[PDB]
Design an enzyme around this catalytic site. Structure first.
Site, short mmCIF file in Angstrom:
data_model
loop_
_atom_site.label_atom_id
_atom_site.label_comp_id
_atom_site.label_asym_id
_atom_site.label_seq_id
_atom_site.Cartn_x
_atom_site.Cartn_y
_atom_site.Cartn_z
N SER A 104 3.98 -33.79 -4.08
CA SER A 104 3.30 -34.97 -3.51
C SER A 104 2.08 -34.57 -2.68
O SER A 104 1.14 -35.35 -2.48
CB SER A 104 4.26 -35.84 -2.60
OG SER A 104 4.77 -34.98 -1.61
N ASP A 135 7.69 -36.40 9.17
CA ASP A 135 8.76 -35.84 8.36
C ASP A 135 8.62 -34.32 8.19
O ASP A 135 9.38 -33.69 7.48
CB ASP A 135 8.92 -36.56 7.03
CG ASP A 135 7.75 -36.38 6.05
OD1 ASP A 135 6.85 -35.57 6.25
OD2 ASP A 135 7.73 -37.12 5.06
N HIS A 138 4.72 -34.43 4.89
CA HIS A 138 3.62 -35.24 4.52
C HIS A 138 2.70 -35.51 5.71
O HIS A 138 3.06 -36.32 6.59
CB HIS A 138 4.09 -36.61 3.90
CG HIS A 138 5.09 -36.43 2.81
ND1 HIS A 138 4.75 -36.06 1.50
CD2 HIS A 138 6.44 -36.49 2.85
CE1 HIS A 138 5.85 -35.95 0.78
NE2 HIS A 138 6.89 -36.21 1.57
CL LIG Z 1 6.91 -34.03 -2.86
#
Ligand SMILES: [Cl-]
Ligand SMILES: [Cl-]
Ligand SMILES: [Cl-]
Ligand SMILES: [Cl-]
Ligand SMILES: [Cl-]
Ligand SMILES: [Cl-]
Ligand SMILES: [Cl-]
Ligand SMILES: [Cl-]
Lengths: 219, 219, 219, 219, 219, 219, 219, 219
Positions: free
Chosen positions: H15, H191, H194
């Site tokens: 991500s 977190d 991110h």
């Molecule tokens: Cl990810």
């Protein structure tokens, strides 16, 4: 680095500054700073100067002229008690003369622009540690395109106000002009005003260069 | 009025022709024709020649070059069995050269443009009552702006083809040029390509003039 | 051309004028002028008379009767300081009598309609350069359909007010009637009131004819 | 009450029958039956004959002509194994002749209408306990309005077929005609086709009267 | 027919009356009357008594108790100047005692219910031509279910108020009870309160029976 | 605690088990488990036995009968390779008999129910460490309410099967019955089936008690 | 069981308490109580103590510090006339110091936190039957993580206030710490603050243990 | 500047690389590149090296481990024919071990990680001008936090591979570590994975430094 530790930096302007920032507060997260040059400036300052300890506010509003800035100055700038105030305004002041030439009430001609911007800077200077004046710009390489020509005239006003008031100065037009030696405008902005990520980096880099940012710090 | 009753008139091109038309069919109601010059043409024909009974199809597709038209010609033109075909293409063929100047594979240069467009007209001419070739355009009054200068080259090819093939011909650039004696491009199109209602009316009227429309009919 | 250079033209009326115009301002872009006859008028004026230099405002509101126009006249017309005011009202004044015959408070009968419209025109005339009065209409070819018959009566009032006050006059009923020699109503408007693009062009053309528009200017 | 318990009653037709019913099945709850005369019939049967236990299916499809019904008959009627079939078709067959008068291929003229509808009844009759033929209608009191006049021709065909085939028969036009002695069409349907709750109740009651419904049961 | 020509009928109540009616006005189209018993009543009255000439308003609000009705009575009933006022209230007055037994402030116990409803009827009666009092109901066949039992007690109050004030009276409980000889509650309302189309027809039919509606008029 | 670490526990049933779980997989996060008793069980196991490491899958599907479970057993149970299978089915099997009493084909009567459920347990038992059979339930304290009475019959079958097959057994009806000594059904479930958080907690706690959960662990 | 029959319990706090509760009222259904520990507490109390007869209100607001609680105390707590008030606040008071360290106006340092929380408890105590003070928490097992360390300091304040005022006390930190012997934080909360269902059960169980809940009641 | 004009630079990872990029192509405009470090790199290259003409593709996919990369390598890397490949993978490979510690099959342990990543580099190296290996990272300053400690092991493998294979190498963890001397992790990422714009700028600048970017070019 012109900005000092612990200081509040407030950015104000039009859609170029706004970039979807959170209304009304414009602070409290990057989401809140919008998705353009302001967020990039703050990001790079945090990446490279994390100890600088700065608080940041974005009060950009899409569509604004300097006349709009004046009507909300008290609430959106003075009352926020910033230490540093960055202003980038003039694009709409000029653009309305060209895109809506027969709606004259939307236009902010050079006399209103100079008097109003000068007056906001003079009133604000005693209340803050410093002011950064960023020229408006038009992403157009031909100095004789009528809108580019007028926009350069607006930029001269900003520059002369910055001189007279000892404000920092960012010539955003000069930053685009450098890239416009290689690229046709449409490669950065179909509309010659609202650019891609790359244009926002051109802006952020010009601002950072002026405040004494170093990409790799020498100490 | 060159078009006769019971005949099918089909328009093909890029976003300027598309304007949100219904996909795939592009026929059957005004909404299906989209919201620009095509719909305006049809509404003016119906207003002034209600007895004509013309079927109209819009096969515009946003983003297309003439290379994209050749790839879908069989299904989107030949299979529709039109009596009249209007083509307006070239904006993207050019624009890519300036907004993605290093993605050369997306460019359609003038030599490919000319032969491809020629091929389409020569393929189609035996099957139809007539062809209307509309030049591309760029809403930019300075003939030396690099993209305007390139566009004019493509426009000149279109005119050569129309003369050689006995096609109807609409110089859209010259229609814009006249208005640009007065208005700065942004008053018609921020991006110099996609225009207001006014620009779509410029196009609609240029097309109608070429097919012999009368605003008030004499007979 | 009755309208002069530099003048502000303001359109007011019901949904036929409104056509999704921007609320409250109704100005500043074509998006803001809505998607019907007003936008088409302004587009064609810009296409063919770009030097005319006119500012345009749309204050149409869906559902309005002349009683609604009166309640907002001060703010939506007088205070906008227009030079020219075009009015098209009466469709709902009449339609409510037929679609909601037992809700009499929604009805604006001929006495209220004449007194109110006359009074708005008399009050407005000294403040502006000119007034255009457009009749209401009903897209129905049978003069003896009760609603068509009443709508013609409302149109006579508009015409007589235009005469008495030396206002320009557009007989929108006559424009539809011409097309209704060829087309059944449903081909222009399922509901006999809200038409297709073609109906909006019928309206725009009728308005333009009355203000001395030329499709191709003779000078 | 002609319908017996445990029997399946299937309605088919155009938007007037459809009313937003669930696709493809059109069965299983009220929402699946849509929001007009079909649902009202079923709710009144359940209110007054709760012990009947009738399965009801709605196979209406908006836009359909009898030519569209024949094309889907096997799957939408025969395969459902109904005991009773109600047909209401013809509105579009006619309407297209007046709202798209030059798209002749979309027209179903009276000779094709009659033979197609006859075919459907003759195909279905051996498989069912009964057929109910509902005439199309047009909400228009003037018998000389061209579309009303055409509709009455189609209605007369429906009645001939019902007499010849021993089908149940609902004259929907005569039910509307009575109400149109009082109300102008717009009070029931702006477009003269799609009506209010009142119009759906007109239809529901006409259908129920024909199948022997009693509002208060005697026994 | 108890209701006379030209009269305004106003319905007020809870979600059973509301059924998605338009707020605040609740009038001006069937869309505005919501999608249950009120719309069905008005539809059937128009279908069968179109000359009755009645104006209809729906002021039902989801969730209301009689205490809520009292707080808005002046604005939503008196000020609408109705001729006839139909009230159906009590379902929530009772239901909250059972579904939220420990939130006593939400409950409207029998003393508050009788005093408040009596008082609204006494105050309203001199201002109008007539009142229809509809009992609340609970779709539950066992007289000894505690909520059914309490709801019957609320209904006795409504009945006794109707007697004393010479108001029309609709026993909605009795209408459901008849159907509840055949159907388990869940077949009409999973929740024993909000029913299907069929339940709304049960209600509409009970109301119409009381105002002297005939399904087929004998004159 | 009957369940051991590293084991897979799979729940299957109707909407009460489903509660909006992710389709098709029903595994991998809480959101995937839906928002009722299954998720609560898993959250309480994790809260109190965090070291267990149980994989949990939710294969509930809203609307299902035991006839629907048999049709998808191979893919939704056998192919998941569970160690424990929890079944709660029967609500719909019964409910259809009362909410669609004339759609008999949708009913699963007690004789089919029993043999089908027996079949599922007998098929699955050799492949798993254990089976938990949860009775269906109806939130209704009156044992003579027809649906409650039928539900109890199905519940008694479930208990017979669990005794015969040595399955774990959860009497959900008796857990509700205790709370229904105090609360009227509507305080838990308007529709007597789908309950509040409280009802899901009733279910969760009943299930946990049967598998040997301790709220505060002794060891 | 500390809470008595017939009493109103009001929960206030930040997002942990809020969990999407209904604004402004926070009462009248579980939907209204949100989807975390508050709803779970109330559910389990109803499942196991249904006769307790308690009314519940959730006034949690996402983002709040104790400074925010003070600004709305009068309206959201005093005026609701609760019998019992549960407070869980401090997470944001602390978190802002770490996530937005240079926006000091968002921070509620230990002096403001203690004075304000102490003062709310002292003012509220005489007006209610009891107070439950729940510590804030941070789902992080290392006592020397700076935010965990500060959060423990905030928790000591809550504990000492609870002692001095004879309020009930829930050490939420201790409840998480137990589970954090087995699980890394991310298995309960990626962000160490907003947990899964399991975290909300950890919270609910800690609260219930303190009010004398029994999972299986011994009488 | 290691990258040359006309070359294709392809980024792949999880991500952090994905950031909402367009699927499947991940190329063609800024929006297609997503909103994090990839887009920033490209915008800074374009700002400062506009003449370079680099094609950039983003093949990040949220949730991926190196095991997921190997499974899609042929289509997402080899088939794109890049000149430069940037890899950043490992976050998930580790994170699963801590957020789903009992779902072992979702874990990619260090021995599989190393050999898989090695395989990808060895496969790709002959086809490209170069490879850039970016370490994974965890925004956590305590080297003994279990996940940070594991991440550092994976990072050390990445560095070994880059030395052995002569790949370019970006230590992202060391770039974060420097900023974490000042900021608590939550100021960059709630977190710890991110991050804000600032964190994406940390990554972008680290990558650019490794490929020889100059903020102000010397030549
Ligand atoms: Cl990810
Ligand atoms: Cl702007
Ligand atoms: Cl295009
Ligand atoms: Cl209107
Ligand atoms: Cl239809
Ligand atoms: Cl309600
Ligand atoms: Cl279900
Ligand atoms: Cl929060």
């Amino acid at each position: 680095m012109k900005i000092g530790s612990g200081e509040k930096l407030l950015f104000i302007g039009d859609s170029i500054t706004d970039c979807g920032r959170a209304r009304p507060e414009g602070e409290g997260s990057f989401g809140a700073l919008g998705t353009g040059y302001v967020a990039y400036v703050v990001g790079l300052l945090q990446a490279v100067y994390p100890e600088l300890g700065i608080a940041v506010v974005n009060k950009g509003i899409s569509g604004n002229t300097v006349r709009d800035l004046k009507a909300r100055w008290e609430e959106d700038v003075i009352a926020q008690k910033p230490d540093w105030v960055s202003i980038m305004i003039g694009i709409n002041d000029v653009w309305r003369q060209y895109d809506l030439p027969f709606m004259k009430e939307k236009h902010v001609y050079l006399d209103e622009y100079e008097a109003t911007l000068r007056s906001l800077v003079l009133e604000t200077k005693p209340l803050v540690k410093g002011i950064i004046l960023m020229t408006p710009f038009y992403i157009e390489g031909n100095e004789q395109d009528p809108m580019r020509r007028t926009m350069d005239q607006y930029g001269r006003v900003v520059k002369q106000i910055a001189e007279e008031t000892n404000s920092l100065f960012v010539d955003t037009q000069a930053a685009f002009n450098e890239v416009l030696k290689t690229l046709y405008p449409a490669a950065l902005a179909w509309d010659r005003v609202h650019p891609s990520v790359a244009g926002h980096m051109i802006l952020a880099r010009a601002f950072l260069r002026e405040i004494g940012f170093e990409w790799v710090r020498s100490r």
